[PDB]
Design a protein around this nucleic acid. Structure first.
Lengths: 122, 186, 145, 122, 9, 51, 250, 50
RNA sequence: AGUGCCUGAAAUUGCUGAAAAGGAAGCGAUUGGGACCUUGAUUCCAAGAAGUGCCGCCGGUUUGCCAUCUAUCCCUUUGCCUUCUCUCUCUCACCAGGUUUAGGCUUUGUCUUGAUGUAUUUCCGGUUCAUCUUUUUGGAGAGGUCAGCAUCAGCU
RNA sequence: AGGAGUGUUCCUGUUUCCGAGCUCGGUUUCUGUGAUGCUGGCUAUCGGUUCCAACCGACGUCUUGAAACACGGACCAAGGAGUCUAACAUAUGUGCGAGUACGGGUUUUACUCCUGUAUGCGCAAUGAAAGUGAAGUAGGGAGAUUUUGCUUUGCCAUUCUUCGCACCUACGACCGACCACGAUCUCUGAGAGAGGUUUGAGUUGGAGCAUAUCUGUUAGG
RNA sequence: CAAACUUUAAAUGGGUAAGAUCCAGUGGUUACUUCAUUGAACUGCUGGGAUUAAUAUGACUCCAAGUGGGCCAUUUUUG
RNA sequence: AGCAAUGAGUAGGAAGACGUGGGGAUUGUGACGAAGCGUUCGGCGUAAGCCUGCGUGGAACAGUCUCUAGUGCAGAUCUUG
């Protein structure tokens, strides 16, 4: 794949007054306050998420590499990404052993399927 | 920036899909939306819509009513997007050739004995794709407990709506409003 | 299915679905059917006419069973007793007797129509119309008690 | 018996489905692509088939099939047939023939996979 | 008491 | 949490029977049994054996 | 499309589907040819019909002069024929509108700023325009400005009551199928029917989705005041000088 | 399933046997819509109250 | 893990490093600066080694394309008989007769047995050979990214 | 505008010039629908995470109105507010359909499975009560059929007469109540027949019952 | 000179109509109506007519929320 | 998949998603290092959120389809620390 890649935003949408108070975490919440400036949409303030900002249908969930990641647990589950190797890049999971990585990583190269993690545990 | 009403973008009121997770009814609709789109006959377009209806519009037609709609027209296949019940008052059931979604097991016994074919909708497609020489029917929609209550609201002058009342007889909603001797009739 | 209720989606909105101006107060308008006479009167006239007042003479210790009387119609009957029908179609001699008490009704009313097969109906009570219809069928009427 | 009726049971859920984000894939044998549709999937369809590197250290290819017109459908030992094939461009022509006898429609994607498969040894 | 329901009992 | 919270459902007897029939139908067909097991060495479904 | 039967590898069911494709492609091939002969014959009859319009536009312009020269040689004056079509444009926007003026602008299909529409002259349609005047700049078109509108900004509405789609006029076959009842096979036969005001003006006008003009290159003067008054404003009707405006709004 | 085939009955000792029997017309029957709904409600019936 | 000792968050506090600061600071949008992180493709043709060990050829084993012959499914009743079940079907207390099931039998017109062996799996000894994989040695072949100029299509 | 290809056979354009009466037909080269063409730098840039600078912007709640000289809020963590039961109701999904759904018998023992007799609500309403207790027609209409207009074996007509479902609109008949009659009989009664600016939550070849969930009303913390 | 006088009398607003739910011709029904097949209303059949000003345009039933403190501006206007 | 038109919003209504503790079914991870925690190694999603390198840690946890609820906090002169 690898088509052009256009993003509309690169900034996150941080939560209003996440900067000010440490109790308010940065994860977005719509301000529902009656007098709030952010929801009322004054200029020179936090932008709200609209559906307007939605990325392209062709290139949604697309990595910088060109691929879509599809994360994977066992040696058996890479076989699934055999005919879709060009399309999918495989992310070896959070939990996995040093042993079972070197069974996965070695079996992936037999199949010509790209693995994202590399030099994962050495 | 257009002077438009609702800037429509105006929706359609009727149901736009199947609601059932019944797999046989879904496959029935897939048949009759291939057959509606492609064939052109307005019979199949109507049957498609009536298949997607809710339960209160798929109301049961009796075997004895299905006689008298089909009275002059004996040869023709009697279609009913709905259920078919036995009439117990009907002594000698007429033979017909019915198609419907579901027959109760009395009405299946009564037709099949009387010399009378009993089809499903997928069988009707094989015989009659266009709906050529058929009779659409449907049972009356506004004929139930609930629909007695609807309309002008019971205490308004010349309504025939039922009130929602816990029990029948005197002592329940028969005094002030209902008699002239108790204030007013209305 | 707490999942599917509006509170779950509604959560996160301050009013909670009741509105900022009017509020979800504990008991505006009284309790139960209170206020029917005065403030809630418009609702009573319409919706529930005839609610206020007393009409008929009261019955002390009214006992059901004294008055009970389950009614079959003339249009049924046949459903009551299918083989006899094929017997009583034929022959033109004897008749299929319908003791209406045995299925469990007392009165017979001729709302319906009946095939012309001679028959005898035995019931505690007969409507005036039922008798005329039965006689036309060539049937006979018998009283039990 | 019916392909579409079996599908309307098991489309949403079965042992095989393996999701991540919008992606879903299907780990059965009898399945080119490993996508979850009516056409490709093993379970549901009449005359499914797979191309899998054979499980003998993965030295060679299997064409896995069922007997045609669903002959021994209740007897899953007897139903499932195999044909071993050597990894080459030459023995593409034997596979290309053997597929179109069972299913003519699946023939382009067999040629897509068989090309990929040859490149695959444990 | 609002709307057209049964008077509650 | 009170104890009188209604825990049990009455399902209708006809719907219970239709269900068991449908479930017994799915005992045959290696489509549905493989979908929901390992049926590689098994000679037949439904797998009947003598008394 | 013709399917490959695969001569290496045969079905029974597929031989039905190959057999119909010969019947379909053969009926398509004659119908592609025999329809193309009709359209070839039709656009010839359009082409020759186009020239005699270009005569009639020039000739009636010349004949208009010879009348009012001849009458001037007498003593009297030639009262010219009053203009049968006008070209409204909307000037003030949506907000703050009385509910009668709001209605009339919907009846002229003037639903937003900088929208043109061709609109007919009766006694009825004049007395509507009295009520709307200060949201509107209208006046009498010419054959240049009508040609420029329908070629450059010409869209056409296409479908049942409910949804029409608004399609760009790229070819005559869109015009032909919808207005081929009334004559009117080409795009150039619209331009006659609007400029002359034919018997089928109502049909040909309501075919055209109302024109969507951009803001005028050199601006307005002052949309408060009339085009009359010596502050040189905008609203009201300019008898001819709307032609100079609208040529900038393209 | 629109047939009632002859089912092979097997031995305990052995993978084949000559005993056979007809399918009993339950395996014809038409429903995961309904089996969900029932099992859902029927599994609630062994709840101890807390 | 060192005795209120498992893991040990935030508020808060000290040091070190890194910046910024003319009567608040934070924040939005847009660039830049400083630290810091990150990238002869894909292949294709010879030779060599390390893998792998298909078919072929035997012994054992299991499927059966296609041409035949044929079963019951199903309905079509027939000749029934047996055991069930329902029934205001008969003198009626008992047998019989219809209705519903099963079974052992019957006349009648695309989910499989038994023979023929297209084909095929598993199993060891092989009998060694194909194959493709990674790699190291040459031979032919360069993607990526950012630009410049050019020609068109749309709008201006 | 960009993974290859072949190439103009059809098609529109521009052009060689041959004939027929400015218009059409035949023919040759050229270009489009079938156009991306040439070339360079870097293999670290491009890009990304952080902090900082600069120009421009930028002052929870009740209320018509809050940045307010309206009230709450020093900081952080954890805890914290439409729930459960009952009575109805509409809507929707599932089962069976004139029906529909405390005990006992089984059992590995709170599940499951089977089952007799009742009752519930429904299948008939109406009167205070004693009591009594049910013939369709017309108009518009889904659809089918027979036939008339258009690119053709398909397209939309209202062109036809044929039957017209649901449902709405208009009017009937029948049942109960009230009012007002009554030929004739086996005369405390029955009843041919014929009514009424009266009235019912009636009727007109029945749709309901059980269950699941939401929403609403009401009682309860 | 007139809010609680008027001969006369605008603008702006309000009603109804502009055909397929229509028009005419002719027969029947009727306890109504007439001195009277005179009328009246309703009906059967037979003709006449497809959008009969402009412009635009697809047009019930059920269930329920919130709300019932409003304020301002141009013109009219009362203390 | 294609074409066209459209896109403000408190109170309020409806639709599709994200997340948390348990039950059923299924596919798995883990003393060669699970959960949790920290972080300028980072990535994806309009967003709720998800995935992941490195460090600490020392024993259990997760994906998918369903069932269920003591299921999401900045505020209450909120409560305890």
């Amino acid at each position: 794949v690898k088509r052009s890649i256009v993003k509309k935003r690169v900034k996150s949408f941080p939560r209003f007054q996440s900067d000010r108070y440490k109790r308010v975490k940065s994860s977005w919440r719509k301000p529902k306050g009656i007098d709030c400036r952010v929801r009322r949409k004054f200029k020179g303030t936090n932008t709200m998420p609209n559906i307007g900002y939605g990325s392209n249908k062709k290139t949604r969930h697309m990595l910088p590499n060109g691929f879509f990641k599809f994360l994977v647990s066992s040696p058996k589950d890479i076989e699934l990404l055999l005919m879709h190797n060009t399309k999918f890049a495989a992310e070896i999971a959070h939990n996995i052993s040093s042993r079972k990585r070197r069974e996965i990583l070695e079996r992936a190269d037999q199949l010509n399927v790209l693995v994202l993690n590399r030099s994962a545990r050495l | 920036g257009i002077d438009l009403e609702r800037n429509g973008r105006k929706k359609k009121g009727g149901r736009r899909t199947v609601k059932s997770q019944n797999p046989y009814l879904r496959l029935l609709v897939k048949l009759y939306q291939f057959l509606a789109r492609r064939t052109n006959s307005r019979f199949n377009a109507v049957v498609l819509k009536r298949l997607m209806n809710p339960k209160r519009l798929k109301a049961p037609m009796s075997l004895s009513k299905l006689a008298r709609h089909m009275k002059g027209k004996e040869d023709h296949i009697a279609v009913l997007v709905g259920s078919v019940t036995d009439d117990i008052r009907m002594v000698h059931a007429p033979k017909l050739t019915v198609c419907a979604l579901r027959f109760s097991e009395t009405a299946r016994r009564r037709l099949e004995k009387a010399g009378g074919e009993c089809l499903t909708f997928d069988q009707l497609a094989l015989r009659r794709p266009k709906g050529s020489k058929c009779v659409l029917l449907r049972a009356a929609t506004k004929s139930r407990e609930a629909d007695k209550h609807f309309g002008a609201a019971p205490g308004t002058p010349g309504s025939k709506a039922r009130p929602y009342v816990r029990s029948t007889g005197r002592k329940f909603e028969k005094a002030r409003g209902r008699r002239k001797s108790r204030g007013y009739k209305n | 299915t707490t999942r599917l209720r509006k509170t779950r989606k509604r959560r996160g909105h301050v009013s909670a679905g009741y509105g900022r101006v009017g509020k979800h107060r504990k008991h505006p308008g009284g309790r139960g059917k209170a206020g029917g006479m005065h403030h809630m009167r418009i609702n009573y006239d319409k919706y529930h006419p005839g609610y206020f007042g007393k009409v008929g003479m009261r019955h002390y210790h009214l006992l059901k069973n004294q008055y009970t009387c389950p009614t079959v119609n003339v249009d049924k009957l046949w459903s009551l007793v299918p083989a006899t029908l094929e017997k009583a179609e034929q022959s033109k001699d004897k008749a299929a007797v319908i003791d209406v008490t045995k299925s469990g009704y007392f009165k017979v009313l001729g709302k319906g129509d009946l095939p012309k097969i001679p028959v005898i109906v035995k019931a505690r009570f007969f409507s005036k119309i039922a008798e005329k219809k039965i006689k036309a069928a060539g049937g006979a009427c018998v009283l039990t008690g | 018996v019916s392909s579409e009726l079996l599908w309307q049971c098991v489309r949403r859920n079965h042992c095989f489905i393996r999701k991540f984000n919008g992606i879903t894939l299907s780990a059965e044998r009898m399945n080119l692509t490993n996508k979850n549709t009516l056409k490709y999937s093993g379970i549901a369809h009449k005359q499914p088939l797979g191309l899998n590197r054979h499980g003998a250290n993965n030295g060679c290819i299997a064409l896995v099939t069922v007997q045609k017109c669903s002959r021994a459908m209740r007897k899953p030992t007897r139903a499932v047939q195999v044909r071993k094939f050597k990894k080459s461009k030459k023995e593409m022509s034997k596979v290309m023939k053997a597929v179109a006898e069972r299913r003519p429609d699946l023939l382009k994607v067999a040629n897509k996979k068989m090309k990929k498969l040859i490149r695959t040894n444990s | 008491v609002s709307k057209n329901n049964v008077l509650p009992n | 949490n009170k104890t009188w919270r209604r825990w049990h459902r009455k399902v209708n007897v006809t719907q219970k029977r239709h269900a068991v029939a449908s479930a017994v139908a799915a005992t045959g067909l290696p489509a549905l049994v493989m979908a929901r097991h390992r049926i590689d060495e098994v000679p037949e479904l439904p797998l009947v054996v003598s008394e | 499309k013709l399917l490959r039967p695969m001569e290496g590898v045969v079905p029974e069911r597929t031989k039905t589907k190959i057999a119909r494709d010969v019947k379909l492609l053969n009926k398509m091939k004659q119908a592609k040819e025999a329809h193309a002969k009709k359209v070839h014959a039709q656009r010839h009859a359009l082409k020759m019909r186009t020239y005699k319009y270009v005569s009639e536009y020039r000739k009636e312009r010349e004949n208009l002069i010879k009348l009012k020269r001849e009458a001037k040689a007498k003593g009297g004056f030639y009262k010219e024929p009053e203009a049968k079509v006008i070209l409204a444009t909307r000037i003030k926007g949506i907000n703050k509108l009385a509910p009668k003026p709001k209605m009339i602008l919907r009846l002229f299909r003037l639903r937003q700023l900088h929208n043109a529409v061709f609109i007919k002259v009766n006694k009825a349609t004049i007395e509507m325009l009295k009520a709307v005047q200060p949201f509107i700049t209208y006046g009498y078109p010419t054959l240049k400005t009508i040609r420029q509108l329908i070629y450059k900004r010409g869209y056409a509405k296409v479908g049942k009551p409910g949804a029409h789609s608004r399609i760009r006029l790229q070819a005559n076959d869109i015009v032909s199928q919808h207005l081929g009842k009334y004559g009117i096979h080409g795009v150039e036969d619209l331009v006659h029917e609007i400029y002359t005001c034919g018997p089928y003006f109502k049909q040909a006008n309501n075919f055209l989705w109302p024109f969507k003009l951009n803001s005028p290159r050199k601006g307005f003067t002052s949309k408060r005041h009339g085009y009359n008054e010596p502050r040189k404003g905008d609203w009201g009707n300019r008898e001819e000088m709307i032609n100079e405006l609208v040529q900038r709004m393209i | 399933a629109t047939a009632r085939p002859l089912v092979s009955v097997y031995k305990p000792e052995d993978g084949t046997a000559s005993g056979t029997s007809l399918m009993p017309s339950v395996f014809l029957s038409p429903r995961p819509d309904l089996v969900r709904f029932v099992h859902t409600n029927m599994a609630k019936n062994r709840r101890q109250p807390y």
